[PDB]
Amino acid sequence: PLKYSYINKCSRFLSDDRTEVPQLVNANQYSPCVSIVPSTVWEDGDYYRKQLSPLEGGGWLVASGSTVAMTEQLQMGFGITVQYGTDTNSVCPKLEFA
Amino acid sequence: QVYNFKRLVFTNCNYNLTKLLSLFSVNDFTCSQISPAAIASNCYSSLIL
Amino acid sequence: YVDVGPDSVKSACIEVDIQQTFFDKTWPRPIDVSKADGIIYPQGRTYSNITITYQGLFPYQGDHGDMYVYSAGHATGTTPQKLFVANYSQDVKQFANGFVVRIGAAANSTGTVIISPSTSATIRKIYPAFMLGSSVGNFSDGKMGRFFNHTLVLLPDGCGTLLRAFYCILEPRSGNHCPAGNSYTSFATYHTPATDCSDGNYNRNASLNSFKEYFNLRNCTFMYTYNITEDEILEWFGITQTAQGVHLFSSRYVDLYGGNMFQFATLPVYDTIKYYSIIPHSIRSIQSDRKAWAAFYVYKLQPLTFLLDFSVDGYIRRAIDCGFNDLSQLHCSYESFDVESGVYSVSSFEAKPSGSVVEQAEGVECDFSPLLSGTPPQVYNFKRLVFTNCNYNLTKLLSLFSVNDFTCSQISPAAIASNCYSSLILDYFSYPLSMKSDLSVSSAGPISQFNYKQSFSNPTCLILATVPHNLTTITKPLKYSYINKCSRFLSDDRTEVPQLVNANQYSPCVSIVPSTVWEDGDYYRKQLSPLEGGGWLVASGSTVAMTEQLQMGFGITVQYGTDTNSVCPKLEFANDTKIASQLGNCVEYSLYGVSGRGVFQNCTAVGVRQQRFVYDAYQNLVGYYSDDGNYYCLRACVSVPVSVIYDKETKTHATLFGSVACEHISSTMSQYSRSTRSMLKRRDSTYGPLQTPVGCVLGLVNSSLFVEDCKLPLGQSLCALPDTPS
Numbered sequence: 001p002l003k004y005s006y007i008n009k010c011s012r013f014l015s016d017d018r019t020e021v022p023q024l025v026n027a028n029q030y031s032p033c034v035s036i037v038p039s040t041v042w043e044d045g046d047y048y049r050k051q052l053s054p055l056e057g058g059g060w061l062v063a064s065g066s067t068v069a070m071t072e073q074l075q076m077g078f079g080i081t082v083q084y085g086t087d088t089n090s091v092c093p094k095l096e097f098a
Numbered sequence: 099q100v101y102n103f104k105r106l107v108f109t110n111c112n113y114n115l116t117k118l119l120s121l122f123s124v125n126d127f128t129c130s131q132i133s134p135a136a137i138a139s140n141c142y143s144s145l146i147l
Numbered sequence: 148y149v150d151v152g153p154d155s156v157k158s159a160c161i162e163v164d165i166q167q168t169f170f171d172k173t174w175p176r177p178i179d180v181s182k183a184d185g186i187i188y189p190q191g192r193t194y195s196n197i198t199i200t201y202q203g204l205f206p207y208q209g210d211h212g213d214m215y216v217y218s219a220g221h222a223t224g225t226t227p228q229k230l231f232v233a234n235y236s237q238d239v240k241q242f243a244n245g246f247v248v249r250i251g252a253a254a255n256s257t258g259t260v261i262i263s264p265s266t267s268a269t270i271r272k273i274y275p276a277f278m279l280g281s282s283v284g285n286f287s288d289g290k291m292g293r294f295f296n297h298t299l300v301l302l303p304d305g306c307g308t309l310l311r312a313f314y315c316i317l318e319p320r321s322g323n324h325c326p327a328g329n330s331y332t333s334f335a336t337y338h339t340p341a342t343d344c345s346d347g348n349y350n351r352n353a354s355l356n357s358f359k360e361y362f363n364l365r366n367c368t369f370m371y372t373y374n375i376t377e378d379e380i381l382e383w384f385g386i387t388q389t390a391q392g393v394h395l396f397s398s399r400y401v402d403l404y405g406g407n408m409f410q411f412a413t414l415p416v417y418d419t420i421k422y423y424s425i426i427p428h429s430i431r432s433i434q435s436d437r438k439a440w441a442a443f444y445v446y447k448l449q450p451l452t453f454l455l456d457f458s459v460d461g462y463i464r465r466a467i468d469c470g471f472n473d474l475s476q477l478h479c480s481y482e483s484f485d486v487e488s489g490v491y492s493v494s495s496f497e498a499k500p501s502g503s504v505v506e507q508a509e510g511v512e513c514d515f516s517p518l519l520s521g522t523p524p525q526v527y528n529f530k531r532l533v534f535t536n537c538n539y540n541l542t543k544l545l546s547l548f549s550v551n552d553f554t555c556s557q558i559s560p561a562a563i564a565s566n567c568y569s570s571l572i573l574d575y576f577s578y579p580l581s582m583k584s585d586l587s588v589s590s591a592g593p594i595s596q597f598n599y600k601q602s603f604s605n606p607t608c609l610i611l612a613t614v615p616h617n618l619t620t621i622t623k624p625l626k627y628s629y630i631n632k633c634s635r636f637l638s639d640d641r642t643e644v645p646q647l648v649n650a651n652q653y654s655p656c657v658s659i660v661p662s663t664v665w666e667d668g669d670y671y672r673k674q675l676s677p678l679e680g681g682g683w684l685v686a687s688g689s690t691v692a693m694t695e696q697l698q699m700g701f702g703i704t705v706q707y708g709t710d711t712n713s714v715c716p717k718l719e720f721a722n723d724t725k726i727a728s729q730l731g732n733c734v735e736y737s738l739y740g741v742s743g744r745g746v747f748q749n750c751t752a753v754g755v756r757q758q759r760f761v762y763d764a765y766q767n768l769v770g771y772y773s774d775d776g777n778y779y780c781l782r783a784c785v786s787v788p789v790s791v792i793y794d795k796e797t798k799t800h801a802t803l804f805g806s807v808a809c810e811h812i813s814s815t816m817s818q819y820s821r822s823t824r825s826m827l828k829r830r831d832s833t834y835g836p837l838q839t840p841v842g843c844v845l846g847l848v849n850s851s852l853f854v855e856d857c858k859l860p861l862g863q864s865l866c867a868l869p870d871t872p873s
Contacts, residue, residue, distance in 0.1 A: 006100045018567050018712075028390040029419060034101050035282075041099075053284060076122075078147060079103075082132075083391055085143030086191035090110040092141035107392060107415060143191075144391050 004068040004075070005041040007033060013049075015058035028081075033063035041065035108145040149367040151315075152352075155359035158322025163335040163427075164221070167234035169262050174442050175211035176252060180471070183463040185247050185383065185446060186455070187396055187408045193461040200482060201455050204244055204387060204448040208468035209823055212249070212444040215425055217273050218262045220337060222434040227339070231262050235427040236333045237291040239283050242420040245448040247385030247396075247408070250274060253441035254379040260439045268439035272379050274303040274310070275443055276336065276354070276426035279386075283422045287319070288331050292424055297368065299393075299416065302336070302426070305353040306344045308375045314416050315367035325361050334361055339431035354428075369415060375399070383408050387448070392417040405462045454479055472826040473791055474800060488795040490803075490859055490867075496787040496818040500744070501734030504726050506774060508739075509719050511538020518575055519547065520620040523699060525628045525664070527598040527648075527657050529576040538717040539571065545610070547618070548699065551580060552611030555703075556588050556601065563608055567715035569708030574599070578700030579627040579691040583611055586700060593631040593689070595648075601702055602650040610701040623697040626690040628664035630656055638681030651704065656686035664688035728773065733784035738771060745783040747771075752778040787811070789820055792859055794869045801846040801867065802827055809836035809843035839865055 010033035011022045025031040036050040047064035115138050129137060178184045185206045220230035251272030258270040280298035285291065300313040319327035326334065336357045338344075343353040383398040383406050393414040401409045425445075430437065456465035469479040473493040477486050513534050524530050541564040553560050576599070578586070585592025586609055588601050601607035614621050633656035634645045648654040659673045670687035720727070731747035741760065750770070753761060761769040761778075770780040788805045804812060813836075814828065831845045839847070840863050852868065859867040 001099065004099070016565070017562050018565075030103075031101055037101065039099065039102065055283070077126075080137070081146050081390075082137065082140070082142045083144040083146070088109075088143035088191055089141050091108050091143065091145045092112060093139055094112040094114050105417065107417070109413075146391070 001070065002040055003070055005065055006067075007031065007037055007063055007065045009047070009062065009064040011062050012052065013060040013062055015052075020062065033061060036061055037063050037065060041067050043067070106147045108147070109143070113145070149315075149370045151364045151367050151370060154363045155356060157360065158320045158325060158328075160320065160322060160325040160360045161220075161337070162229040162324045163332050164229050164231045165234050165333060166231040166262060169231075169264070170216055170218070170233045172214070172216065172261070172442075174214060174253075176214075176249070176444055177211045178206055178208050178446065180208040180453075180468050181465050182406075183456070183466050184406065185408075186406075186453075186463050186466055187247070187385065188463070189455075190410075194457040195461075196457055196459040198454055198456045198482065198484065200452060200479065202450075202452045205451045205453060205468070206247060206446040207449055207451070207822070208471045209825070210446050212446045215275075215443045215445070216261055217275075217428055217440045217443065218430070219260070219437040220429040220431050221262070222432065222437065225433055225435075227431045227433070230335055230337060230429045230431075232333075232335050232427050232429050234333070235425050236335065238424055239292050240423045242279065242388075242423045243447060244450070245385060245387040246423070247383060247446050247448065248275065249381060249444040249446075250384060251379060251381040251441055252444060254381065256441075258439050258441075260437060263437070266437075266439075268437065270439040270441045272307070272381075273440040273443070274307045276303060276428055277301045278424050278426055279420045279422065281419055281421045286326055286331065288329060290331065290333060292334075293326075294422070297366075297418070299420070300358075300426075302354050302358065304355055304372075305338070305350040307377060308349065309351055310373045310375055311355070312369070312371040312373075312414065313367060314369035314414075316365045318363035318365040320361055320363065333427070335427045335429060336361075337429045337431050340436070341431070341433060371412075371414075373412070378403070380404070381406070385448075388417075388420055390417065393420075402462060405464070407462050452479070454482065454484070456484065470822050472823060473789070473802075473821055474793065474826055476821075477791070477793070485795065486793065488793055488858065490790060490792050490861065492788070492790045494820055495789055496816060496820040498733055498784045498786055499818050501729070501732030502724075502726065503734050504729055504731070504736040504747070506727055506738050509538075509717075511536075511714075511717055513537045513539040513544075513571070513714075515539075515544055515573070518544075518573075519618060522622045522624055523575055523577040523697070525624065525662065526576045526578050526594060526700065527628075527630045527654055527660065528662065529574045529599055529653075529702065531572065531574050534571040534573075534714055535569065536713045537571075539714065540716055540718060540721075545612070548612035548614060550610060550612045552583055552586070552609065552700075554587075554610070555608035556603070556606060558606035558608065558705075560608065563606060563703065563705065565716055566705075566707075567712045568705040569711040569713060570706045571714050572704045574702035576700055577624050577627055577697060578611060579694065579698045580611065580613070581691050582627070582629070586611065594629055597630045597633045597646075597648050597654050597656070599702060600648045600650045600652070601704060605704050605706055607702065607704040610703065612699050612701070614697040614699065616696060621697055623693050624663050626663065626665075626693055627698065628688055628690045630654060630660055630664075630686055631689045632656075632670065632685065632687040634685050635675070636683040636685055638675075643685075656684060659684050660686050660688060664690050666690065728775070728779065731779075741768070743768065743783065745781045747779040747781055749777060750780040787818070787820075792861075792867050794859065796872065797869050799830075799870060800827075801844065803842060803844045803861070805842040807843055809838050812836040812843050812845075841865055 010031050011020050013020050023032060036048045044067045045064065050061040052059045052061060127134065187203065189201060189203065215235060218232065221228040253270050254272040256270055257267065260266045260268045278294060278298055278300055280294040282295040284293050284295060286293045294317065297314055297316050303310050321327040323330050325331060336354060338353055343350040380403060385396045385408060387394050393416055394410050395412040396408040397411045398406045398408050400411050452469050454467035455463050458464050465484065467475050467478050469475055476493060477491055478484060514532055517532060555563055582594060585594040587595060588607065633654050634643050636643050646655055659671045667690045668687065673684040675682045675684060729747060730749065733744050733746055735744045736742060756772065759772050763769055768781050770778055772778055787807045790803045791800055792802065793800045814831065827845055834846060836843050836845060837847050837849065841861060854866055854868060857866040857868050861867055
């Protein structure tokens with residue numbers, strides 16, 4: 001990536017301009033703020049906003065982010081989860097039945 | 099980017115995770131609610147990466 | 148991306164006429180839970196003929212569903228005309244943990260054409276089409292239901308034997324009657340039986356082609372197809388979504404007759420669905436050849452629990468929605484479909500919520516009264532009042548003057564009045580309207596340059612106004628005045644450095660200038676001490692004639708606290724219902740941060756007065772002293788016990804509300820104890836409440852009979868006879 005990037009804020013402004021509602025990310029779901037945030041954050045501390053639709057009651061989507069410098073070898077990570085079941089257990093380690 | 103994740107849902111297939119481990123140098127490996135050995139050896143309805 | 152094949156060539160589409168009033172039919176279809184209607188089979192397990200409790204998503208038993216009817220497009224003579232369709236494209240719904248549907252329920256029967264219903268055509272099964280996704284909004288013509296980014300599409304193709312699923316980005320067409328065009332009405336799709344569905348060659352792309360005429364396929368990430376065979380027998384279908392992705396369920400693949408649903412398929416898409424709609428469709432057949440279609444139904448899933456009556460072959464044959472009625476609760480408590488006869492307690496009515504009552508300290512007050520008397524200072528000499536921790540009404544303050552200039556910086560002028568802040572600061576001065584062009588934080592004029600400036604680190608505002616003829620305590624300067632020069636001569640007596648006024652501060656030159664400027668163009672000089680580096684202060688001013696009413700100006704700035712916003716525009720029930728007390732109701736209350744729900748009633752006072760909260764030994768509030776000086780007593784609220792009487796021999800039941808008495812009893816209740824009480828109403832629609840010595844009851848009847856043993860005694864001398872045996 002040009003820079004490693006992340007969202008360090010995600011909240012929505014109340015339509016009356018006095019309070020703001022935080023939006024912590026839900027387990028196993030993209031944060032709602034991803035719809036306004038760019039594929040990379042162009043500069044550290046950049047922030048973006050989108051007006052909420054009338055179906056949402058108005059107010060503004062708000063998000064901000066930060067970046068980390070690129071490195072000689074790519075750094076990456078993984079998340080792993082599994083799902084238990086009975087007759088749906090079609091995924092297995094490779095097996096030998098000899 | 100951390101808010102842009104790719105997901106791979108696996109069903110019906112066979113695996114050998116040590117082949118993947120040979121491809122990278124791991125600087126942090128820790129399991130939760132399961133031993134790291136067992137998660138490699140357990141059969142599942144799905145595997146999600 | 149997916150090889151979907153080519154986009155349709157013409158940009159043009161058939162017009163879609165909305166004829167929705169023809170579709171106003173009423174054919175409700177409640178779930179027969181005892182037939183196991185709509186039950187999705189449990190995951191990964193099967194069972195013997197033992198009954199089990201279960202938890203999962205299910206339709207509510209009493210839901211009659213949502214009905215939709217597909218219909219033929221208009222046609223005349225031997226050819227097609229513009230489509231006449233239902234307004235179903237506008238029905239955006241919030242997705243809510245899936246749904247299930249019925250297909251073909253009215254099959255092998257007759258009905259009407261609907262759009263031309265006088266023909267009374269027979270009706271046949273037709274498969275539904277749908278669209279799902281994470282966002283919705285207006286079409287460029289303001290039309291309802293456009294979806295954004297990628298969306299799910301489920302579309303039957305050609306005949307019902309082919310079904311396809313898609314995940315793609317739709318793209319609008321600019322042709323006549325199409326989504327980017329401005330002649331667009333509403334989206335629809337169609338099938339044309341004259342060439343589609345040939346008996347030797349079913350048209351596998353028929354539905355797709357009519358779909359493509361309104362939207363170009365773009366960036367399509369998934370496509371699937373499935374094989375179906377015809378059968379007029381009713382089928383069930385539904386959808387759920389999990390962290391493992393979307394899943395499809397149907398009765399067709401496994402249980403054609405029993406209707407049990409199994410997971411037919413799954414999808415790789417795990418993107419959350421926030422919205423749901425049904426896609427409208429129409430038949431393009433010849434007018435004489437039009438065919439009426441069977442009604443289509445939809446029901447919504449909920450996190451309910453049920454008894455399930457498995458057969459020895461593992462098909463669920465019967466079920467009990469535990470929350471549907473009190474009797475169903477009784478069955479669930481014993482895990483059975485035949486509870487032994489008796490009298491049994493069931494859960495109490497909750498009573499009900501009522502509007503809130505709150506008492507808190509009031510009368511913040513905002514030191515603003517200095518603005519209304521004496522002579523206001525000249526604009527370079529402006530007077531400041533700082534406000535923290537206090538209550539205000541800026542619009543009331545500004546109704547004391549006629550405002551001729553209402554502007555603000557970095558805040559709308561309405562918002563600064565209604566917004567709460569950590570502080571509120573107001574500067575005021577006399578100011579002629581002749582100088583109003585020079586009053587802005589951005590102005591090139593001498594007022595912004597030397598007399599008054601405001602910081603750009605905080606929201607700030609500027610107001611010009613004039614005094615009403617009834618504010619006789621306000622007095623005016625002989626002339627309005629301002630400083631039009633402020634600089635310091637450098638100590639070498641040739642170089643000079645201008646001194647623009649500092650934001651939120653008096654200009655340094657104000658120290659040499661007189662409290663008013665006596666004449667236009669007056670100027671003064673002050674020698675500076677060697678500690679200043681020498682030089683001379685230099686300043687001058689200008690004037691405007693006095694006027695019949697004082698002209699005034701104001702500057703306002705605020706600081707918004709991160710969590711310190713203690714100044715707010717609180718009002719003492721202005722424009723409100725005056726809820727400081729009720730006499731009363733179980734309406735939730737707050738008393739100086741103490742809270743609960745309960746009933747209040749004026750009663751004698753107990754000591755110690757002015758300790759506010761009277762409590763019992765268990766710290767339950769007993770009552771409260773109000774700021775009107777009256778004690779009010781609090782008894783919280785009470786609930787109504789409920790019990791039932793069940794006679795399994797006659798399969799009948801009745802109920803008792805106990806001690807509540809029939810003054811609070813009616814055929815339905817607002818409180819409420821169960822999702823419905825209508826099972827009682829099945830017979831109690833015919834009878835008013837009856838008081839008994841134990842309590843008010845429903846369906847009991849006064850026979851005045853004397854019987855030794857009812858097998859259902861109610862205690863006391865009360866008894867409960869069964870109706871006569873079969």
